[PDB]
Amino acid sequence: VKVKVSRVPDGVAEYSVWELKLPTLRQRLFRCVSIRENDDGTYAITAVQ
Amino acid sequence: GGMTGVLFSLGASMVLGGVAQMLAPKARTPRIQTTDNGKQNTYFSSLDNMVAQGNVLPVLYGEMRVGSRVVSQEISTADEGDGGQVVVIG
């Protein structure tokens, strides 16, 4: 369950790569950025539709 | 100063005006008059002669027959003459 097997992986992932799992018959959610906000705490605020 | 509290997210605070407004900036309708009756003139048409006193010179971008701004109007006596010598008035 936790472990998985990829037929042909690329040896470039170190620890922080993120895996995303896509099934079939799934309506993937698209999303468009309009408003982006900066701050001195060093992060961004994204407002999107 | 290290942290930035009060993130203050803005979601529906800008949706509340409408959703197409945040993708397209909408258009400005003209003001409706009463003596004009019901002729709803827009900002890109003019089928009458205007007066060029302290006003701006209009521009044209494609087709669409337009009026003008009158700069000089004068009436004189029509003298007899053509592009030649044939000047018969009989």
Side-chain angles (χ1 to χ4, degrees):
Chain A
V1 290
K2 277 203 23 166
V3 71
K4 277 284 161 264
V5 158
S6 159
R7 47 228 178 73
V8 46
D10 193 8
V12 279
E14 172 101 23
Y15 155 90
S16 315
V17 69
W18 25 74
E19 39 86 22
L20 271 64
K21 185 282 181 203
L22 294 184
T24 88
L25 48 78
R26 164 52 31 71
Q27 219 175 285
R28 92 179 292 80
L29 302 177
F30 264 42
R31 190 62 42 54
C32 178
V33 162
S34 181
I35 320 295
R36 173 226 53 69
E37 295 188 343
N38 266 16
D39 42 68
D40 289 43
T42 279
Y43 31 99
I45 287 325
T46 54
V48 316
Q49 335 85 28
Chain B
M3 88 294 275
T4 306
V6 196
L7 66 162
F8 233 137
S9 98
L10 68 185
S13 178
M14 81 175 48
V15 160
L16 184 139
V19 50
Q21 313 314 80
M22 76 179 38
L23 269 38
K26 209 56 183 302
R28 273 90 181 141
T29 164
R31 324 191 41 101
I32 298 85
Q33 293 84 320
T34 278
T35 74
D36 184 352
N37 244 335
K39 305 283 310 312
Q40 332 164 264
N41 77 84
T42 59
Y43 303 74
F44 43 95
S45 98
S46 298
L47 283 303
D48 67 27
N49 295 356
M50 315 214 89
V51 52
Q53 166 52 50
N55 290 323
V56 311
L57 189 148
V59 317
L60 189 41
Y61 278 125
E63 281 276 330
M64 84 160 306
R65 47 163 277 196
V66 292
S68 88
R69 306 191 152 263
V70 180
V71 53
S72 63
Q73 198 183 311
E74 181 186 289
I75 314 168
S76 147
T77 305
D79 80 42
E80 177 33 71
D82 69 0
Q85 294 88 6
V86 186
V87 291
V88 160
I89 327 101

